[PDB]
Design a protein around this ligand. Structure first.
Ligand SMILES: [Zn+2]
Lengths: 53, 62, 183, 104, 78, 53
RNA sequence: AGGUUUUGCGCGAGUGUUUGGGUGUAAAACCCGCACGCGUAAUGAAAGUGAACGUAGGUGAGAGCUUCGGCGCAUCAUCGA
RNA sequence: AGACUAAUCGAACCAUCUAGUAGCUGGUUACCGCCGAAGUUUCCCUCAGGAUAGCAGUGUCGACCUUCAGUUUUAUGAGGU
RNA sequence: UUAACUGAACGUGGGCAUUCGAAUGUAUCGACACUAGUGGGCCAUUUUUGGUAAGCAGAACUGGCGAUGCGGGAUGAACCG
RNA sequence: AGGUGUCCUAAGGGGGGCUCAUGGAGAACAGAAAUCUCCAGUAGAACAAAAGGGUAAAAGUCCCCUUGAUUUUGAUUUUCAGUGUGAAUACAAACCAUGAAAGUGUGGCCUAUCGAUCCUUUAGUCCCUCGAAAUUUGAGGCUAGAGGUGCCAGAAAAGUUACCACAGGGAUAACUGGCUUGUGGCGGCCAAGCGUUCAUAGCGACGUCGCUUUUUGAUCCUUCGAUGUCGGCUCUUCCUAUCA
């Protein structure tokens, strides 16, 4: 439930799932997290489209 | 006897005392977790492209 | 009140050698004068490396010198502010001229046997005051026994402190899944 | 909970390495030997004066045990072991239940 | 073992006959659903069956005593 | 009571070790005694060698 | 007494005279060598076996040097043997 | 009557093992200069106590790396007070 | 991997600064080694739980006393400057 | 305000046809309620259990075939020191089930349902050792399960002291003092009614606003290297809510 609403970067592609990299904030330091999500939950993001345009 | 149970009063100030350090991003990420089937073939691909570019001095000249 | 985060913060690098060698004191005087009144960056780097402690001046070997004497560097001057050590593996020694802080007994003999020349940091300033046509070299800083124990922890693959090594010393629980878990 | 007397599953035999018919039987622990190293050491520690030298467990809390199935290949006579969850009812070869035949 | 098994056999038969009254009467079955009824009677099918076999012990009888009691008690309670 | 990354100590110093300590302050004094005994023995065996084959 | 990191010093793929012997202005000073300790090779419970495809590898950064084209120490990440 | 046994008794007096152990009270000796905290996380027959992470000092090395930020603006997501 | 040199990652060569593509600051950049004390806390604005209530018991963000003098509140660890 | 130490050879896996709870109108015995037929019907039903989420040519229901509840090890998520245990997600290399096929399947639709060192016991390879050399018993090793710690990161454990002892604690009770006033005591406001008739001569229901610290509770701030703990006798002074 922590990742419901966060944004990340794809790092692995498989038959029906993708691997995403997200940054989690533990007290006083950041940690890299790697999760496996089925494609029914992910969605392309328009965050970078303004820059690319 | 009884005593205070828990608190979070001074934790935020302690963390920011010498910065919240974000790990540095870098050009070549590791390939840990990628599926092995694509990993085996990628190894063979890089082996060939090194030999071909080495032959550029006495050879193909693409 | 002024509301500053830092105040009276000191420097982080050595500004003078901690050794009391009399001859080294003379050598510092020479290069302290050269760096002030010369534009060559080579002199400023040499000055700081004279202050460093012994663990920050690891030895270099004859083999490491021969490695960097290729691809058009056969005519340059090698400067090493450290000790220089003979290598037993190298069978044929090339021809070179070296300026170093000190040489071992065997390294000096084999360098001059092939037809080379051994210089000194004071003679170097007399011949090449600006350091033209020179290359600097260092030894392996992390190739020390004490460094392998740094940052020990789980999933780190470091070296533990054990009074001996064998099947009775550690291994067992926490080193194999047959006894509990693994690291 | 009942399980059939026979089922076919993977066999790790040297020559089968495929699905093969197996017979299902329950596992029973054997008798404790009188010449194991642990028993020989225990006997010496108790001799002479001094009394009881090792702890004796008293505070039990579990009411059940896990059931272990022992299988047997019909070809190479190789055996397997499959653990189950904790259960009260175990029986091999029982009859199947019937649907829609209610009667009192 | 013979006495313990025979005692548990009587207790399990007694409870099966006891629950037959609940499932049989119309007052309780009026507000009690089909979906629970056919699953209880489905469990009762192998319950009558395992009496025919002879290897069953006291443990089995106590287990099906509590399994039947929990199954029926959710229907009766709600 | 260990506190940091240490080597596990094993010092066999729980008996009354202080009662049996053997300092050697007579190392040079003993050496003089042996040399006086050798030259005294050599004088007794005037023409003979000291040792044996 | 036994460990550990840091500073100064000698020698350096080696290093350490003093258990002991020779000698002496005598508990000082000076000299000698066979063994032995740590290091130079790891890995398995064990029997055992035992480190170069390449100018000791490829790619991206690097102080300094340079005939101005380039060669690139230490160290960080990554793919290989 | 738990009474008496040299002013000592619900187990006499004298020397030694003995400087018996204490998560508990009390004390701990000249000056100047610079930096400057914590009562919070996890486990323990743990709750007047320890290990572990955090806050703090000192010793440095790599560059003077032009990298960064308890901040604002612009584009685009999540929430059920 | 695809009916398929059709795709996929990693590559050679070439093109694009006249302006490297929001504001302000940079009185403080990165990494490593060793270790001290602490682990009984308390008070105030806003939000807030049990209680008739309490100078009572328990929490969230931030600022304070403890570890700190000075000028005001006659006096007063926490209020104002 | 509640729940767990279980249950399932199907209540697991695949495929196909169908749609529930309830309501309206009809049919010999038949009635509120037995079986049959038509129309409406967004889930108001069902899904082993506490509660929440989810599902309609299904995840519900009936029918057909089956044992992916199997073998060898690694990476990742939650509690977190980014240690252990529990549980969970996505691939790889084998062997299978089902369906015409695309596909699905590594136990129960998701969120709980459980366990270290030492010791014992079974399965596996055909393996290593018993150190003077051989061959058979026996014993010892390597890899995976089971026997248990519920105080559940895991000692083997019954009372009394009014004969008593020691190190400490105002971090903690029994007495005064301090804050509060529910209970105790005392005093007001409104006016239905009682009072021969007439609310207020004298009272006052249903409601509502206060004061005091001579009752009793709540709290635990000050004293445990000590503040002598019931009652009476004696003697002085002060308060007013006034017995004379
Ligand atoms: Zn077989």
């Amino acid at each position: 439930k922590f990742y419901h609403g966060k944004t990340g970067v794809v790092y692995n592609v498989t038959k029906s799932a993708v691997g995403v990299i997200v940054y989690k904030r533990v007290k006083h330091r950041y940690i890299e997290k790697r999760i496996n999500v089925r494609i029914e939950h992910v969605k392309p993001s328009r965050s970078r489209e303004d820059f690319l345009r | 006897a009884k005593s205070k149970n828990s608190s979070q009063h001074n934790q935020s100030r302690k963390a920011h005392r010498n910065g919240i350090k974000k790990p540095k991003t870098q050009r070549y990420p590791s390939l840990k977790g990628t599926d092995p089937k694509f990993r085996r073939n990628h190894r063979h691909a890089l082996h060939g492209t090194a030999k071909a570019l080495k032959e550029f001095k006495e050879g193909k000249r693409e | 009140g002024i509301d500053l985060r830092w105040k009276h913060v000191r420097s982080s690098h050595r500004k003078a050698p901690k050794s009391d060698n009399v001859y080294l004191k003379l050598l510092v005087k020479l290069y302290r004068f050269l760096a002030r009144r010369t534009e060559a960056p080579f002199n400023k780097v040499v000055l700081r490396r004279l202050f460093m402690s012994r663990i920050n001046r690891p030895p270099v070997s004859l083999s490491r010198i021969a490695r960097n004497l290729k691809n058009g560097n056969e005519k340059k001057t090698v400067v090493v502010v450290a000790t220089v050590t003979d290598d037993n593996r190298l069978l044929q020694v090339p021809k070179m001229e070296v300026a170093a802080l000190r040489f071992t007994a065997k390294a000096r003999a084999r360098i001059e046997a092939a037809g080379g020349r051994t210089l000194t940091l004071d003679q170097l300033a007399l011949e090449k005051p600006t350091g033209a046509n020179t290359l600097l070299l260092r030894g392996p800083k992390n190739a020390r026994e004490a460094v392998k124990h740094f940052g020990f922890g789980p999933h780190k693959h470091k070296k533990p402190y054990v009074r001996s090594k064998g099947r009775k010393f550690e291994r067992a629980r926490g080193r194999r899944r047959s006894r509990g878990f693994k690291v | 909970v009942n399980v059939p007397k026979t089922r076919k599953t993977f066999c790790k035999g040297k020559d089968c390495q495929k699905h093969t018919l197996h017979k299902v039987t329950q596992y029973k622990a054997g008798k404790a030997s009188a010449f194991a190293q642990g028993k020989r050491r225990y006997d010496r520690k108790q001799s002479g004066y001094g009394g009881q030298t090792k702890p004796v467990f008293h505070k039990k809390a579990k009411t059940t045990k896990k059931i272990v199935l022992r299988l047997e290949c019909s070809v190479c006579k190789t055996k397997k072991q499959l653990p189950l969850k904790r259960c009260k009812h175990f029986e091999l070869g029982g009859d199947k239940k019937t649907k829609g035949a209610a009667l009192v | 073992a013979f006495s313990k098994r025979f005692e548990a056999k009587q207790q399990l038969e007694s409870y099966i006959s006891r629950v037959e009254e609940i499932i049989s009467d119309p007052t309780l079955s009026l507000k009690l659903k089909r979906g629970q009824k056919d699953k209880i009677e489905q469990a009762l099918s192998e319950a009558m069956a395992q009496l025919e076999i002879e290897d069953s012990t006291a443990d089995e009888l106590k287990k099906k005593e509590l399994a039947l009691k929990r199954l029926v008690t959710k229907a009766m309670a709600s | 009571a260990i506190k940091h990354n240490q080597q596990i100590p094993n010092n066999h110093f729980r008996k009354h070790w202080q009662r049996r300590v053997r300092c050697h302050f007579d190392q040079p004094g003993k050496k003089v005694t042996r040399r006086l005994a050798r030259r005294a023995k050599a004088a007794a065996l005037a023409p003979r060698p000291v040792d044996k084959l």
